[PDB]
Symmetry: C2
Subunit: 678 residues, 2 copies
Amino acid sequence: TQRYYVERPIFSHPVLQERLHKKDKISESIGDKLKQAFTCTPKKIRNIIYMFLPITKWLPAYRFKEYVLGDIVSGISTGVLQLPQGLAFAMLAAVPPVFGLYSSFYPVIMYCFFGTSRHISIGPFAVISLMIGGVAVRLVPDDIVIPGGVNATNSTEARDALRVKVAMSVTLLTGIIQFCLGVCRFGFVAIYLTEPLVRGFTTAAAVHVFTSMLKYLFGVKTKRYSGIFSVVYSTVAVLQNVKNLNVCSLGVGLMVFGLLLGGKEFNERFKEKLPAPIPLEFFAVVMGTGISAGFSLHESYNVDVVGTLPLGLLPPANPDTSLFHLVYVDAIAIAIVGFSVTISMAKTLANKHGYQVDGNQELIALGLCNSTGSLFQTFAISCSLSRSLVQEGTGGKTQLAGCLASLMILLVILATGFLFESLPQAVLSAIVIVNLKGMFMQFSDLPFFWRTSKIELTIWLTTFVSSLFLGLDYGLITAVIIALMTVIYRTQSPSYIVLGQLPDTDVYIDIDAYEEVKEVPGIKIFQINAPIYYANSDLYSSALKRKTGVNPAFILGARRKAMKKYAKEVGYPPIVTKSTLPEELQRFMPPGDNVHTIILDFTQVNFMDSVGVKTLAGIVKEYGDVGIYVYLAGCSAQVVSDLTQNQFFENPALLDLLFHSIHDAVLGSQVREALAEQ
Amino acid sequence: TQRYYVERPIFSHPVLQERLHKKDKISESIGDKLKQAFTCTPKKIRNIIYMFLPITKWLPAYRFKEYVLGDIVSGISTGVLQLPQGLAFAMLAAVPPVFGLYSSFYPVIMYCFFGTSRHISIGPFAVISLMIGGVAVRLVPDDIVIPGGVNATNSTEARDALRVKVAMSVTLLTGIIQFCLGVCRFGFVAIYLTEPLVRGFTTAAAVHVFTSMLKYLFGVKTKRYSGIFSVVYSTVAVLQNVKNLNVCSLGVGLMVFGLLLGGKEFNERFKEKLPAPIPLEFFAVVMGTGISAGFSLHESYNVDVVGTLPLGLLPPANPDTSLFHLVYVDAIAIAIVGFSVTISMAKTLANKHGYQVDGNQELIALGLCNSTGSLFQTFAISCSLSRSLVQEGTGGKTQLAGCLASLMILLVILATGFLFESLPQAVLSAIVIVNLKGMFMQFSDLPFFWRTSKIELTIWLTTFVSSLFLGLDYGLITAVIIALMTVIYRTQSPSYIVLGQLPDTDVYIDIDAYEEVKEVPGIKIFQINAPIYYANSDLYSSALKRKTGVNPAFILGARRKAMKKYAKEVGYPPIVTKSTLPEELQRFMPPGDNVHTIILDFTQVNFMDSVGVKTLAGIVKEYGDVGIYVYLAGCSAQVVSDLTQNQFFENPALLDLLFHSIHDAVLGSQVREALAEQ
């Protein structure tokens, strides 16, 4: 009770206004830096070169004597992990693996040339390109290509080249739109994608891909289906075709999968410093190819296989404007959605170390990567998670050996072509399924958010379900829409609370939560913790009337009833704001409360609008007509301006209805009542 | 300086917490009123009957000796005005006028049976039904109907019946969806449509209809065009076809229009009590028909005409489910959009007198009206503005003679059929163009909003332009989307202001606006007037760092530079929140400011989320690591809960970082500094 002594005069609005003067702070050419920019200063040019090219400044900063070795081992490990994942994803998107290797190779060096993140991976998604191949199959049948005179019995390479072409088209579209959007300084557009939304989205995608690799584990072939409920159709078709599968395929897949989990668990039991990360994928692939060569795991057992690798560089084939118009006409939505996923994933992965990274810069860098790749016969690209978890778990922070991993895979795409034609698909399916562990453990958020709140759980469940059932593009877009809608909903249902003054103090708290605060007689206090705009005004008015229990409508009606019942015989603009009491000391007083002023707390109201101003004017006019005073709380500049600009401050007297604190309003009302005693 | 004496102990968080206890207030069966509802009490049943049927209670309340006469004259005037408008709109939507009369007649009595507003009109729009007829023309050509063996040369009645059928279908759809949506207690969905949006939308519609009636003034026929840029095509086609028009048609139209404006202006110059409202439409129609009969204003002059009226009652033809599926498959969007326009217009017109009106109730009442009409071969319905402006300007508040106006038009639709076959279209076009005066004067909002703000002008212009160029449905839907987006945008760009304490007081105001307040040395204050959620957190962090000028990144970097430069020779979980000073009294102090605590004002933060909590934790951890204290402002229950539920309140010490006022935080920090002096 020692400190916090105030003893202050009562500032309503005008007193504090007169206590102060104004400033200017403003010059000419506001925002018009062009008249002061545009010089040949070396500083601006060199800085522009710096921020469009970071490797210039990455050049010196490189440590040694263990930093080099850690970097190199990191790059080697990440490349050897990237390889089989590239193969698997290329097989996923229904393309010969050589183009998956092209994707694994070219954008890596492109990014190393352009990119500020110290950690990176390439090609974590093929499902959207899958849906694109589905649309292309919907365009041309899988067996009716050209009935000409080539005298080919049944070759499926033509449709495959078709799918490659459509992938090139969509990826060029994506890269170009990415350059276009990045150059406009939209490092902010990524912000609209929230953590729970991304979590649920990625989990749904993991489910989709697991369902897809189920069949390539089973060996039993099946026509692929895309579109709405695509997972449903594919799953039920596979379960129908369980009859007549390959038992040896399932056996080898299960054996290798179990061995891989056993190795990973055994390594994880001895996770010490001396044990360095071991590339399980490399052992998996070498043993798979060795066993395939040993026991003749091919047409000898009639099991599936990789097939011949077109070992050799391909010059960049020109994308000819023949049907690019028509194809992007219906590829636009898919391009932009797969886009938004990629950019969001990349940027959220960027914020790992306490380091600053430019947004639009990385956008443009990836745009160059994408356009160049698609011109080099390459599909879409982004950064896969676990790969940086390697670069970081390896301890290699720099990206040098990371991009050197591309030169490392260069030998495979240049030297070893016979080494890889013989290999099944179940092995790759096992690889990806094992990789899916973290995404499948992402489910922990359900009880956590359940205990946490309702809104974030709602968004997570809705985006997950929509992405699962419907296509990925539709799921994402509806998720974003509802994400922006939840904010409106939250501002639709605020917490209307009536205050109660803590005794002999100036703090005001809700009454019905503590059974220790009491309310000052004859006054009422009403607080809304949400801005007042068009969609939220009438709720506020009605809630106020029904919560203060002072609804003037029935008050007036009961007054009329009482007066007519007591009635048994004959016995510049001077606009008054608050009417005097219409009562003439009758004896038919409607039992209830006697409140003489109402206090509207505005400490939470961030902004207003025309509709809010109209509603406030209505409230003021109504209560003054009844004969009840009202006051506001908080002479903030924004709200003062909002009232002023709108047709409110004609100052009949309304400037005399402001306060800069709740307590000031309380004291002022009490003083007015006291002065009323003549 | 007399009043407002406080002398209060310093409540941070825990002190005020211990000062109070809690309550319960909660029983079982929360929200489960079903166990206490569901009885045979006459009260609930009678009230339900009351709120599903108001005319029961309208029955007694009816005044006399001038109230009857005013009501009757109001009803007669409104009917005689409704008639020609009904004719014009029916001609607008490309339908024989008899069905326009059906629309003018049946829903009126339906509404009188079901509806609580004392003022009403019917059938203010036909443009959406026009676009529907456009789609139907897009379905079947205007001249290729059935090449059979009927031996009819060229009759256009078949396509007209087709358009009537499609109108019936869409209107049944609308009525049924209206019942469906109203029964679910959505009196709130109308709230999303704001005043400026509706203003711009209605103005755009007025422009469209004026463009449409241009040709029917010109007499020069033209194939009608709908869709995107529809106004553009129709306008340019008419201006191309200006050659070979009918001069007599234009002459009579201009003469009658000028005479009508002259009469209206002359009446408005003598707007006194004794002059009662005169129905200008009635004089217009009678003189038009008289002159048409006199000088043979028909095929004698080859000018246009109304044509024969199918005088007679039509039994309700059954809507057969033959192509209803296919037609609503692409009529859904148009139905729902024309819907939303109608409901919004009706409800906003309801709030005229200080009276309460139920929303979902009126929704269901209009749904019955619409379904019954569409079953009786009737198109869509709503309330036109000026008509109630008549009912009110006439002074007739009750709706009795208003619905009796339907019985008044009954004579025309039953007795006078020869009286109206002979009449041109330019007269009706003049009627509607004259009616458009208020909608065309709605343009005044442009400079008003220009001086007012930017957001509402933005929304008004955008909705107006989109409705003009594109179709009405597209314009409306994009307007609603951007309307909900502007709120997000407003929360994206708050007003970051740094406070300055008013001397020897406890009020804190922005420094750089008044050049009279000063800041307390060693402290800094930061206020955001917007909630902190996912889409708005990083903006807040970065703005804070760059505005307080205390960005710890460069502070740490400069500290490292200074230390290495001064370096020239060798000479339960105890988690500390704020680190001590890492400085060891060097001499290379980076020149700048010395601030020892930061104050985050939360009096505006309405709510938070997971991302906001993470960002706050990051800020706290960072600044404590640097060695800078921080504090919050406002121990509100909502924000306290938000921090608590999220992984924040493990109370290492964080409960000791709260305050219920800015001044409390200031004093507490000063006390901590003072106590630091040992």
